[PDB]
Each structure stands twice: as C-alpha cells, then as structure tokens.
C-alpha cells in the first residue's frame, strides 16, 4: 500500500528554530543582520556658536 506522508509544516518549524526568521511580504522586509560604517565628521558645525 501507498500512503501520503502528511504535512510536516510544523516539524519544519521545529527545524527552522535556531535561525533568525524574516518577514517577507513585498520584495523584502529584511531585518537583523549588522553592518559596519566608518564615519568622517569633518564638516560639522556645532549648531550655533
């Protein structure tokens, strides 16, 4: 006999634990991650003197 295995969807959740999720609706929402920028401040006024 042959048997449809049945949805694993939840179990797949149990798998994808240990991973940051991401919401994606339109094109991307991506959150988390990190980045490193370097900042050159030269031309900054004190905002009044």
């Amino acid at each position: 006999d042959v048997v449809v295995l049945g949805s694993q969807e939840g179990a797949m959740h149990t798998a994808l634990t240990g991973a940051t999720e991401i919401q994606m609706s339109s094109g991307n929402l991506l959150f988390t991650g990190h980045l490193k920028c370097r900042l050159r401040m030269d031309k900054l006024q004190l905002k009044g003197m």
Partner: protein, 72 residues
C-alpha cells in the same frame, strides 16, 4: 526528517532572538530527562558500565553522561 537537523549551531546568529528562543534548549533537556524517568533500568545498566570501563573516576562521570545522551 526535518524532525532532526534543526539548523542550530550553524552560525550567523544575530543580536535579535530567533525562533524558539530560550525554549528548545530546555525542551531538549526536559525531553530526555523525561525519557530517563520512563526507563530507569537502562540508566542502571549504563551506570554499571560506567563503573566497569575506564573508571578513573572522572572517566566514569563522562561515559555516564553519555548514558544521558544515548538516545531520546
């Protein structure tokens, strides 16, 4: 199946919490300890093995906590 290989150690982990956050670990423990309660004999025999093999004491401890890790 996906039941195991639950993408854990891996990498890339971010500042923000991920999924089961702060559960699946204590899940894992509670699970296996439960199964220990259910099958005490296997604990007994295993421990005996620990007292048999190696047994320079720290060794016993180690191979024993294998018993814990044997199989859910």
């Amino acid at each position: 199946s996906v039941a195991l290989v639950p993408h854990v150690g891996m990498g890339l982990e971010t500042r923000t919490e991920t999924w089961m956050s702060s559960e699946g670990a204590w899940k894992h423990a509670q699970r296996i300890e439960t199964w220990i309660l259910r099958h005490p004999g296997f604990t007994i025999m295993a421990a005996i093995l620990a007292y048999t093999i190696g047994t320079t004491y720290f060794q016993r401890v180690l191979i024993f906590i294998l018993l814990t890790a044997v199989t859910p």
